[PDB]
Amino acid sequence: EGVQAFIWQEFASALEVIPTTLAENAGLNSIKVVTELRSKHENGELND
Amino acid sequence: ASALLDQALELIQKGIHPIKIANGFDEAAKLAISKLEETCDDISASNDELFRDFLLRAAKTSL
Ligand SMILES: [Mg+2]
């Protein structure tokens, strides 16, 4: 909460760039890949 | 316009097609003007004493 929260949030949004450019090199819809990759990572945890 | 071009930019580096964004903006512009219309106050339902005031209030604003 407060100020130093928005920073972390936009930091977590940044790290997501590696999977994006990984997928965009593969010619995939990087948005579709990540939305589904985060969704599967909210359950099946550390392997997706 | 510039922030809209900036908001597009971030979404492009994400890997999204521009035309689908531009389309995605216009249907999102049509929902903004629609809420404004349904919510905007009106000076037509006014008497003569209160219409010449609202016109001053806008004059004030712009100045
Ligand atoms: Mg003005």
Which chain A positions have a beta carbon within 8 Å of B15's beta carbon?
20, 23-24, 29-31
Helix axes B2-12, B18-39, angle to 10 degrees: 140
Q: A36 and B31 in contact (C-beta within 8 Å)?
A: no
Instruction: Report residue B51 as tokens.
Output: 């219409």
Integer Cα distance of B4 and B1 in angstroms: 5
Experimental method: X-ray
Name the DSSP letter for residue B59: H
Task: Tell whether the torsion through CA atoms of A26, A30, A33 and A37 is positive or negative.
Answer: positive
Instruction: Report residue B24 as tokens.
Output: 């995605």
To one decimal, the resolution in angstroms is 3.8
Instruction: Report residue A37 as tokens.
Output: 């990759």
Query: For residue B58, how far is its CA from the centre of ligand 1 (angstroms)?
Result: 9
